[PDB]
A paper describes a structure:
The disease arises in mice and humans from the misfolding of the acute phase protein serum amyloid A1 (SAA1). The human fibril encloses a clearly discernible cavity that contains many charged and polar amino acid residues, making it likely that the vacant space in the cavity is filled with water. Both fibril proteins adopt all-beta folds and differ sharply from the known globular conformations of SAA family members. The murine and the human fibril possess in-register, parallel cross-β sheets and adopt highly similar β-arch conformations at the protein N-termini.
Corresponding to previous observations, mass spectrometry (MS) shows that the mouse fibril proteins are N-terminal fragments of murine mSAA1.1 protein with mSAA1.1(1–76), mSAA1.1(1–82), and mSAA1.1(1–83) being particularly abundant. The ordered part of the density of the mouse fibril corresponds to residues 1–69 of mSAA1.1, the ordered part of the human fibril to hSAA1.1 residues 2–55. The dominant morphology of the mouse shows a width of 11.8 ± 0.5 nm and a cross-over distance of 75.7 ± 1.3 nm. Platinum side shadowing and TEM demonstrate the left-hand twist of the mouse fibril and its underlying cross-β sheets. Another substantial difference between the human and the murine fibril protein concerns the packing interface between the two protein stacks. This interface is extremely small in the murine fibril. Two residues (Asp59 and Arg61) make bidentate, reciprocal salt bridges with the respective residues in the opposing protein stack. The non-planarity of the murine fibril protein originates from the tilt of the protein stacks with respect to the fibril axis and a GPGG motif (residues 47–50) that induces a ~5.5 Å height change of the polypeptide chain relative to the fibril axis.
Numbering used by the authors:
A (entry chain I), B (entry chain K), C (entry chain G), D (entry chain E), E (entry chain C), F (entry chain A), ...: 1 to 69
The structure:
């Protein structure tokens, strides 16, 4: 079992990035979730970059290189 | 079992990025979710970049290279 | 069992980054979650960078290199 | 069982970064969570950097290098 | 069982960075959590840096190097 | 059982960095938690640095090096 | 510089399997060489087998297999 | 510089399997070499087998296998 | 400089398996060499087997296997 | 400088398996060498086996295996 | 400088297995060498076995295994 | 400087297994060497076994194993 959450440069209001594994006889309730935004400037901004999602990376030679100038 | 969530440069209101695995006799309730936006400037912005989603990457030689100038 | 949460440069209001594993005969309640933003400047900002999510990285030779200039 | 939470450069209001493992006959309640922001300047800001999430890293030779100039 | 919480450069209001393991016949209640911010300057700021989350790192030779200039 | 909490450069209001292990027939209540901030300058600030979270690091030769200039 | 001599199942009389490299201002003399054979039985005999002479063998997968029954 | 001599199952009389490298201002003399054989039985005999002569063998997976039955 | 001599199951009379390196202002003499054989039985005999002569063998996985039945 | 001599199951008469390195202003003489054999039985006999001659063997995993039945 | 001589199961008469290094202004003489054999039985016999001659063996995992049954 | 001589299960007559290093202004004489054998039984016999000649053996894990049954 592999669980990997990556969260970056965001504005949230609730109930995020959750992992529920292997429950038995459970029960739950969540409530209302409000996002209210007025007059903001430069919210939720991210620079460059690549996103790799792999399971096995075998024998990688001179690979996975990112250059920023 | 492989679970990989990547979230970046966003504005949300609720109930995101969840992984529910291997439940038995469960039960749940979620509520209303409101997004209200007025008069914003430059929200949810992302720069360049590539997105790789693989399962196996074998013997990668001089590969997976991104250059930014 | 592998659980890895990485959270970075964000504004939240509640109920984030949770991992519930291996529960039996449980029960829970969560409440309302409000995000209210007015007149902000430069909220939730992130610089460059790459995101790798792998399970096995075997024999990586001269790999996984990021240069910033 | 592996649990790794990394949280960085954020503004929160409640109920974050929790790990609940191996409970039996439990029960719990959480309350309302409010985020109220007005007139701020430069909140939740992060510099550059890469995020690696792996389970096994075997025989890594001259790898995992980040340069900042 | 491995539990590692790292928290850095943040502003919180409550109920963070908790690990509940191996409970039986429990029960608990938490209260309301308010974040109120006005007129701040340079809150929740982080410099550069990389984030590695692994379980096993075997035979790493000349690896895991970060240079800052 | 391994439990490691590292907290650094933050402003909190309550109920943080807790580890509850191996309880039987327990019960508890927590109260309201308020964060109120006005007119501050340079709160919750962190310099550079990398974050490694591993379980086993075997045979690391000339590794895990960070240089600051 | 690569020099590989393999000699097998033979009858010789002299001056075999020599490698002279990188000489300067040299000089040499060899003598007479006589092979005299009478009435022999089953001299210089070899069983089956393949002869590979390569310089580079890269990425050979399930190759170079000889079966004898 | 690589020099590899393998000699097997032979009858010789003289001056075999020599490697002369990197000589300056030398000089030498060798004599007569006689092989005289009469009435022998089963001289210089070799069983099965393969002969590989390579310089580089890279990444050989499930290769170079000889079976004798 | 690499020098490897392997000699096996032989009958010789003289001046074998020599390596002369890095000589300056030398001089030498060798004499006569006689092999005389009469009426022998089963001289210079070798069983099965493979002969590998390589310089570099890199990353050999489940390779170089010989089975005798 | 590497010098490896392996000699096995042989009948010799003289001047074998020698390594002369790094001589200056030398001089030498060797004499006659006689091999005389009559009426022998089962001389110079070797069983099975493989001969590997390499310079570098890197990262050999489950390799170089010989089975005798 | 590496010098390794291995000699096994042989019949010799003289001047074997010698290593002369780093001589200056030398001089030497050797004499006659006679091998005389009559009527012998089972001389110079060797059982099974492999011969490895390497210079570097790095990171050998579950390798170099010989089984005799 | 490394010098390793291993000699096993042999019949010799003279001048074997010598190492002469680092001589200056020397001089020597050796005499005749006779091997005379008649009517012997089971001379110079060796059982099974492998011969490894390496210079560096680094990080050998579960390697170099010989089983005799």
């Amino acid at each position: 079992g592999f669980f990997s959450f990556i969260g970056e440069a965001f504005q949230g209001a609730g109930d995020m990035w959750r992992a529920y594994t292997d429950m038995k006889e459970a029960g739950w309730k969540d409530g209302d979730k409000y996002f209210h935004a007025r007059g903001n400037y430069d919210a939720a901004q991210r620079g460059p970059g690549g996103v790799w999602a792999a399971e096995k990376i075998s024998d990688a030679r001179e690979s996975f290189q990112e250059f920023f100038g």
